[PDB]
C-alpha cells in the first residue's frame, strides 16, 4: 500500500485506495454523441463523470 495507492485524475487531486468508476448507458450526453448507431448490448460510455468536459 504505502506509496502504491494513489488513484489520480487530471488536476482533480489524489484519491487513495479503492474508489468507484461507473459504466452506464443511460448517460444523456453520451447517447447523442457516441453510441447513436449502437444498442444496449454493445455501447460506449464516458467513464469520466466530470461535468465540464
Amino acid at each position: 500500500t504505502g506509496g502504491r495507492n494513489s488513484i489520480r485524475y487530471s488536476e482533480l487531486a489524489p484519491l487513495f485506495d479503492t474508489t468507484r468508476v461507473y459504466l452506464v448507458d443511460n448517460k444523456s450526453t453520451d447517447v447523442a454523441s457516441l453510441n447513436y448507431q449502437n444498442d444496449h448490448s454493445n455501447f460506449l460510455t464516458t467513464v469520466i463523470q466530470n461535468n465540464d468536459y
Binding site: 487530471s10 488536476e11 465540464d52 468536459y53
Partner: protein, 52 residues
C-alpha cells in the same frame, strides 16, 4: 438630506463610460491559478492575467 443629493452622486463625465477590464487565459499552456477549476467551456477558462 432629502433631495437627490442624498441617494445620488455628482461626478466627472468620462466618455469611455467606465474603465472595464479584461482577462487573459492560456488554458493549454499554464497551470490553473489557485481556486480555478480546469474546464473546456471558453466562457470559464482559468485566468492568468487581468488588465484594463
Amino acid at each position: 438630506q432629502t433631495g437627490i443629493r442624498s441617494w445620488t452622486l455628482l461626478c466627472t463625465p468620462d466618455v469611455t463610460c467606465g474603465s472595464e477590464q479584461v482577462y487573459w487565459s492560456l488554458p493549454d499552456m499554464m497551470q490553473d491559478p489557485v481556486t480555478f477549476r480546469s474546464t473546456s467551456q471558453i466562457s470559464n477558462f482559468p485566468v492568468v492575467g487581468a488588465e484594463l
